[PDB]
From a paper:
Acetyl-CoA synthetase (Acs) generates acetyl-coenzyme A (Ac-CoA) but its excessive activity can deplete ATP and lead to a growth arrest. To prevent this, Acs is regulated through Ac-CoA-dependent feedback inhibition executed by Ac-CoA-dependent acetyltransferases such as AcuA in Bacillus subtilis. AcuA acetylates the catalytic lysine of AcsA turning the synthetase inactive. Acs enzymes consists of two consecutively operating modules, a C-terminal domain (CTD) catalyzing the first and a N-terminal domain (NTD) for the second reaction step.
A second major class of particles showed the AcsA homodimer bound to AcuA. In these particles, the CTD of the AcsA subunit of the homodimer bound to AcuA was resolved, while the CTD of the non-AcuA-bound AcsA subunit in the homodimer remained unresolved. Our structure clearly demonstrates that AcuA restricts the conformational flexibility of the CTD, thereby enforcing a so far unreported conformation of the NTD and CTD of AcsA. AcsA and AcuA contribute 1,859.8 Å2 and 1,861.9 Å2 of solvent accessible area, respectively, to the interface of the complex. First, the very C-terminus of AcuA (amino acids 203 – 210) reaches out into the active site of the AcsA NTD. A detailed analysis revealed that the main chains of AcuA_M209 and Y208 form hydrogen bonds with AcsA_D255, while the main chain of AcuA_Y210 forms a hydrogen bond with AcsA_R108. Additionally, a loop containing the catalytic residue K549 within the CTD of AcsA aligns with the active site of AcuA. The cryo-EM structure of the complex shows that the very C-terminus of AcuA inserts into the CoA-binding site of the NTD of AcsA. The AcsA domain arrangement enforced by the binding of AcuA appears unsuitable for a productive synthesis of Ac-CoA catalyzed by AcsA and may thus be considered as the “locked” state.
Numbering used by the authors:
A (entry chain C): 4 to 210
B (entry chain B): 3 to 452, 467 to 559
C (entry chain A): 5 to 452
Write the structure that this text describes.
Amino acid sequence: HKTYHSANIKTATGSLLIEGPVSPEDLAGYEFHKDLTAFRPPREQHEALVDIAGLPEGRIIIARDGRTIVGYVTYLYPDPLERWSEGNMEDLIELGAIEVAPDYRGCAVGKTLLTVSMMDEQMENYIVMTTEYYWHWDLKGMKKDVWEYRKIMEKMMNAGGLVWFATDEPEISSHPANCLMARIGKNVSQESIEQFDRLRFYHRYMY
Amino acid sequence: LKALPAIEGDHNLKNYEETYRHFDWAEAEKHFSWHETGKLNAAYEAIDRHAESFRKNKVALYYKDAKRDEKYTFKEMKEESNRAGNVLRRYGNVEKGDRVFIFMPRSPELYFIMLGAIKIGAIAGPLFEAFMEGAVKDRLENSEAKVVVTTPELLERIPVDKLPHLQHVFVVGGEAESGTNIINYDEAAKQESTRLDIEWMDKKDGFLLHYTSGSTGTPKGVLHVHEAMIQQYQTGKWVLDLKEEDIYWCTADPGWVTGTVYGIFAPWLNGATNVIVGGRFSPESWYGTIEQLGVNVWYSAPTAFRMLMGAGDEMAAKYDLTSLRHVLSVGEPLNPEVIRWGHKVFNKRIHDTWWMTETGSQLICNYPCMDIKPGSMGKPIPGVEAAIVDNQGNELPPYRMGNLAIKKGWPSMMHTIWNNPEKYESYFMPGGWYVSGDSAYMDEEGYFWFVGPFEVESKLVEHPAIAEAGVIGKPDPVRGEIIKAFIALREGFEPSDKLKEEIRLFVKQGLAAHAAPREIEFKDKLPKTRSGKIMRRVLKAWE
Amino acid sequence: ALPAIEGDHNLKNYEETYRHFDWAEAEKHFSWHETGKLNAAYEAIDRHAESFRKNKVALYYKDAKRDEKYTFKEMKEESNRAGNVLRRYGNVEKGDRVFIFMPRSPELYFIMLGAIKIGAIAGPLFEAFMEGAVKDRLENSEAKVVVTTPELLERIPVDKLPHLQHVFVVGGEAESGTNIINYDEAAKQESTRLDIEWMDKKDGFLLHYTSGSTGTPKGVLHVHEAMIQQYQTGKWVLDLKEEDIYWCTADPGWVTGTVYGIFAPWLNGATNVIVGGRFSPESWYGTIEQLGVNVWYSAPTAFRMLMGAGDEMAAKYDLTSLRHVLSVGEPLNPEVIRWGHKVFNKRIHDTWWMTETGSQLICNYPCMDIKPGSMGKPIPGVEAAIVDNQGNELPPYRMGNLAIKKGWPSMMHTIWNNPEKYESYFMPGGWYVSGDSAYMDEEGYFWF
């Protein structure tokens, strides 16, 4: 189940309202941000946002200014073909697009978005995971190097208290920068923890 | 690629060339007790020989995990292995040439059980917990093993009723209900005594069983002989560089072959100090292990090293890693990047070692007493004639593709593929050249030789016709791997062969010669998760 | 007369070595004979950690709670950590008396080695003393630093000691006062490398106080160079081969546990075993059976108390690993010899010395016949005699005073700040008198 939550932040550009889990009909009525094309064109992530908002377990948290959406965080279930969803079950939600608009970045927008997202207890019955790679990031938009970029997301994503986890994914390990962020909920089962431990390390015989 | 210069020191293989020219297995066998006595056993010479020598009070096992930090010496390890062998003989009804299987995670009891099983002559076969019920059931069905030791978390994964030849199932720890064929280890060791009347073996009977997931879908049981122990010792003397003061840490699991011979037998045949780190992988735990334990010799795999680099070098800088002396990698051709990272962090060099299950113990190894080429496995150990052969068994001059073969006759061989002499005779080639199925080649010196997708991916987006793409490495027999890209064009652009070459030249001029894609395929859209992330494992699985 | 057993001993022939030994042959054994920098602590532990004994287990620790084991490298690292803590948080300099008031634990050995490593004179303290004894010992020694556990924290009157700057507390939560610092939260905030204060041949490193009938505490000072003898007897009396497990059951607050539980076995590079908690015969025999102790240096009181438990307790355990067992600082009884021979199948060697002598002088040897109830014979390089008041060497088989020719490596430097008492131990003529009465034998045996 879902309980609505909200909070407000203030900056030079005005007041930003961070709606928590929100009903899909209202997202269908917002106006997208033209600058926020980190993953897909606006149409495609609009379809994604409404679809996950319609899922019983998928959730969307939106930080916005007025009637225009500027940042979103998704909690969609892991991709069925992806190895993290081999069980294809429950209590496993993959965090996806968390990035915000370029010129609103540096305003503590992402950390506030994640904290407003994560204070909910329904964030904590399920553990949260996300997989980050170097090619998904703005290489030239902000013009700073690899490891500082990883460190600054570790800082900005520690707002939810997420600790870094290691995995043997051939895709993750192709570059030491690409890694896996995740949180372990306080209401989750120990069997779920062992299951996630098994899932993270597929071919453990090598180490 | 620049060869790593050697470091002067009190090594064991003073001169590799002179030994390779004048090495006989007789002097190697002279290092063993059976050469004078005639009583031979691999487990004996790995444990008891040192437990009776001056290494009796020397730390043999360094066990650390999230809960336990236990330490065992050679005398204590001998006592534990003898107790395990006693309990296996008394309860498991095991005799010479039998099959005893291991279903355990990393723990001292695993090594105790396997050493005890080998000591009584029972052929030991390890297993991995990641296997489902099907894999373990198939392995015991093929092996017809009488005994399988297990853990309570995995007791439910073995079909005891299904297997007719399976007789006893041992469980270790916890509180498992004592069924008709389910006996708990802990008590069975508790009242059982220590002293073991070790049964002495011939040169040509087996002591290790290992099942490898074959291409046909069914595993095969490789049976190594006690003679292999000879080779192990010498390798554990030369490539592993175990001196009398070295702390050796092997990160491989004992369920695999690599953690069975060079994580168990090779270090202890030289009387060294093995380190075992249980529990989940965590770079904090590994770096703390190296720091406070003072690991000198390291034997790990490129996957674990790559995950350690993924952790971050600052976390390594949080600990003291200057105690390292000698680093080695097994299980996959070492990357030069891992070599550079290891040299930068630990100030020590890593050495890739090659061998597989059908090989028994490592043959072609990078050597601390010679210049190290990071991309090369190394040179064959003395007394072992490794080379490159074609499909006809004829030798081939260096610097050309070919199938790596070994001159049959070396002590470390499979005595059989269990209940499958056909797969035996398929492994060896006419002319006495055992074939391992791997591709390799040598160079003039005598060493042997077996890409970031994002830089191509970032290059692709610069076209005004493509919005996104995915690049994978398609395996190649000539260049190793060829670059293949799947392209989803933007609106107003149609797939064609004319524009395919335009992508190749633009990448060619803007990037390296080998960075240009060799295969281009067009899609309406690439596989993407619901959020928008592009995964490439599905792309290579499709290809 | 229990006959000697044929075997490979470090001392091959007693007479040949006795008649043709010079202490330079013992000096060349050490690592400072070619480098000059000499320190007892460096060669007890730090030398082996850079040798082929680095991974050999140096300390077995057992008690009712902890069952960890330490190698020579581990002891070196932990002792360097303790010495760094002492130097930084106590400002203890060369010659400063660092007193240690804490129960049997690995931290005790780490702190003792660290104190001796930085040149400080380490003074052990037994836990059985009540407030006055520790108070007067600390006052007389003018100890700059004391290290203790909270259970004994209230026993030291810090307010009554002007010369006590800092007090270290080990274990538990102890409020960090101005002059009270808890070790543990200072233990893990520095490095494990410690520069060892090298000093000359004549400079003290141990301060042991002996209880006396007078009641005043007497702190003898042993120079570093006493180790010259400490190692040698450890190779002859203890015959510490490379594959022996050594168990010293004497308390480390006393000189015997301090030098024959720390310096004598580790200088030879042996494997020391130590068990915590209150004694119980099952605990000791189980320690023997599990660890398989080869050399067992214990006190005769401990042997009598073990005999009181009965031989059936020993029969329940495996004692075939014992090969060399010895008794400390008391006249062994023939009954103890017989009991040890039937229950361990091995011979006990009674050795004699005192805090003033610093190390064993007259002992039994494995390559030598044993007459029960006898001291044995002096180690080669040490001349012993039976002198009267006038000091003429008395022929054997007559009552007299034990004396040893002065100048042997283990000679004391002085009694702390009491030169008159130091000179009272010596009789003109090159003879030191230990205050014990004994007589010699034609072969050379010594008897009370």
